[PDB]
Amino acid sequence: SAKTVQLNDGGLVRTVHLPAPNVAGLLSAAGVPLLQSDHVVPAATAPIVEGMQIQVTRNRIKKVTERLPLPPNARRVEDPEMNMSREVVEDPGVPGTQDVTFAVAEVNGVETGRLPVANVVVTPAHEAVVRVGTKPGTEVPPVIDGSIWDAIAGCEAGGNWAINTGNGYYGGVQFDQGTWEANGGLRYAPRADLATREEQIAVAEVTRLRQGWGAWPVCAARAGAR
Structure with missing residues (x-):
């Protein structure tokens, strides 16, 4: 029942009155349980004692979705009047719009890296026409x-x-x-x-x-x- 516990959570100090058998338990009860790569000092299984400092780092990966441009698909068409070394954008198409999901890496709630990981097309692009040289x-x-x-x-x-x-x-x-x-x-x-x-x-x-x-x-x- 150790109501003097001070919890530095990813920077944000906060005072806590909950009871629990160990520090992880304590973070669960404050509904901020240790997840993914989160760590803490003292250890997660450490007993709760009075007036105790608890320092947690939040290290997570998070799904984020963004509405981005969808580039048109290039349809190729041959032009035997132009060298094969030349390729031309004859009709550039109409960009559509996609939902790109990124995996975002975050420490203490601040993004540190991301990678695109999936995309659903929402509004389809209209083709572009790319005219390619085919002169024998x-x-x-x-x-x-x-x-x-x-x-x-x-x-x-x-x-x-x-x-x-x-x-x-x-x-x-x-x-x-x-x-x-x-x-x-x-x-x-x-x-x-x-x-x-x-x-x-x-x-x-x-x-x-x-x-x-x-x-x-x-x-x-x-x-x-x-």
């Missing part, structure tokens, strides 16, 4: 090396793959027109510089495989390239 012959293989390709760019064009300074050479790896053409560039763009970095590297790797890195004499050196 415009496949682009994956870039292999790169820090090297980017260094020869770094070296030869200051990094600007769309470079048309005015001289004789074009693009990031400084193609001439003859060699850009001989080795297949024209499927991608009339000039090295009107094509994307990845398109350029594809057409360059054809030179590189014939001669190796030595078609960029200064710049394959400055890069550190065999």
